[PDB]
Write an enzyme that holds these catalytic residues in place. Structure first.
Site, PDB file in Angstrom:
ATOM      1  N   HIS A 138      41.237  42.585  48.381  1.00 55.36           N
ATOM      2  CA  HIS A 138      42.552  43.116  48.066  1.00 55.36           C
ATOM      3  C   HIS A 138      42.871  44.396  48.818  1.00 55.36           C
ATOM      4  O   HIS A 138      43.975  44.928  48.711  1.00 55.36           O
ATOM      5  CB  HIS A 138      42.756  43.294  46.555  1.00 55.36           C
ATOM      6  N   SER A 182      37.689  51.630  45.487  1.00 52.16           N
ATOM      7  CA  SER A 182      37.292  50.225  45.484  1.00 52.16           C
ATOM      8  C   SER A 182      36.562  49.890  46.778  1.00 52.16           C
ATOM      9  O   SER A 182      36.995  50.272  47.861  1.00 52.16           O
ATOM     10  CB  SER A 182      38.503  49.321  45.312  1.00 52.16           C
ATOM     11  N   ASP A 218      36.861  38.250  45.765  1.00 51.34           N
ATOM     12  CA  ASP A 218      37.452  39.537  46.184  1.00 51.34           C
ATOM     13  C   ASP A 218      36.486  40.281  47.123  1.00 51.34           C
ATOM     14  O   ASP A 218      36.564  41.504  47.269  1.00 51.34           O
ATOM     15  CB  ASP A 218      37.750  40.399  44.939  1.00 51.34           C
ATOM     16  N   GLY A 247      41.369  54.713  45.070  1.00 48.04           N
ATOM     17  CA  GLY A 247      40.886  54.717  46.444  1.00 48.04           C
ATOM     18  C   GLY A 247      39.394  54.444  46.608  1.00 48.04           C
ATOM     19  O   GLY A 247      38.901  54.351  47.733  1.00 48.04           O
TER      20      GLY A 247
END
Ligand SMILES: *[C@@](=O)([C]([C][C]1[C][C]1)[N]C(=O)[C]1[C]2[C]([C]N1C(=O)[C]([N]C(=O)OC([C])([C])[C])C([C])([C])[C])C2([C])[C])C(=O)[N][C]C(=O)[N][C](C(=O)N([C])[C])C1=[C][C]=[C][C]=[C]1
Ligand SMILES: [Zn+2]
Ligand SMILES: [Zn+2]
Lengths: 181, 21, 16, 151
Positions: free
Chosen positions: D29, D111, D53, D109
């Site tokens: 993502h 991830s 993901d 910020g």
């Protein structure tokens, strides 16, 4: 914060030999664990409570080179396989564990912390067996509990056809005893 | 026999840090 | 475009 | 020095990446199927797993790989892009509760970042913050196993 570590080489072969003979080391010290060397082998020394401890089978009865000349050992216990000098000026000391954890972490000379499960007053099993070659040079290094406190000093490995399945350590308790002797 | 000499160090007191430029 | 690396973190806090 | 965690950014956002087992992993993502920049040109993803993901490129320069966890511990530590460490207790194979919730911005910020165990080994990759009214009380994460199997 988790246990993390990094290593820095402060000196080379020739500079090491000279310093060895002269006994005078003017280099600046930092760290809880010092990478130690003799003209015959290299291993580790761990500063715990103002004292720089190491494995007798590595340091023998030798003195430690310092900026004020050679420094004589504070403790020597051939049986416990321990020796200790006053912790060098500039090093940081670990403090003994007070949580009775069975989940230990071994710090190797390459600054890798590998987990070991306590299975006795002096043994713990490697959760992930590694070649003995990995542990070479790490005797005298620390085994910390999850809080980063000293549990013991790596003494010998329990190898099986070249693979280390467990380790033998000197629990902090033997240090206090060695100090009281 | 000579003296044991420090040839390196291992620091545990270090914490994550953004490498400067 | 691409994913560009704008910085880096060293977990051990190694100065060097 | 070499970093295990790369702070990355696309035109739209900024997040983190973590090198594990020689690969530079991050969240789909954030990166999508985007290629990662390199002084010799853009290098394409080795692994793309939209379902999980998860995406990964060859570990970039100035990086060092992190070790997968093998102690099973549930005392995890999340590293933010500001280098902050957040103690996160494991509540399941892909979720954990911060020992002290922080406003969602604190985790913004981060991830792609890593969830380390008491030994600094990778337990998983921070997927998304679970917040209640702007307070991150928990986190979602892609466990190392997923990374390990994807390879
Ligand atoms: C420690 O001194 C080593 C670490 C160990 C993993 C290899 N410990 C020992 O040598 C001890 C020591 C004698 C026997 N030791 C063992 O570890 C042995 N196992 C053992 O006794 O197991 C029992 C019986 C189950 C307890 C073994 C594995 C058979 C050798 C005693 C117990 C008294 C250490 O790291 N030493 C320093 C070292 O290896 N230095 C060398 C070096 O500088 N050389 C050879 C020049 C070195 C350094 C870095 C890399 C490679 C080698
Ligand atoms: Zn403890
Ligand atoms: Zn672990």
């Amino acid at each position: 914060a988790p246990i993390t570590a990094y290593a820095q080489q402060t000196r080379g072969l020739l500079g090491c030999i000279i310093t060895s003979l002269t006994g005078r080391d003017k280099n600046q010290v930092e760290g809880e664990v010092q990478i130690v060397s003799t003209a015959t082998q290299t291993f580790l020394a761990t500063c715990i409570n103002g004292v720089c401890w190491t494995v007798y089978h590595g340091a023998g009865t030798r003195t430690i080179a310092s900026p004020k000349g050679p420094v004589i050992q504070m403790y020597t216990n051939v049986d416990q396989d321990l020796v200790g000098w006053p912790a060098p000026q500039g090093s940081r000391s670990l403090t003994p564990c007070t949580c009775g954890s069975s989940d230990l972490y071994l710090v190797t000379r390459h600054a890798d912390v590998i987990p070991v499960r306590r299975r006795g007053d002096s043994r713990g099993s490697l959760l992930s067996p590694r070649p003995i070659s990995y542990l070479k040079g790490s005797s005298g290094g620390p085994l910390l509990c999850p809080a980063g406190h000293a549990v013991g000093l790596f003494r010998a490995a329990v190898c099986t056809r070249g693979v280390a399945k467990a380790v033998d350590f000197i629990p902090v308790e033997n240090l206090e005893t060695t100090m009281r002797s | 026999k000579g003296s044991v000499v420090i040839v390196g160090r291992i620091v545990l007191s270090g914490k994550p840090a953004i490498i400067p430029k």
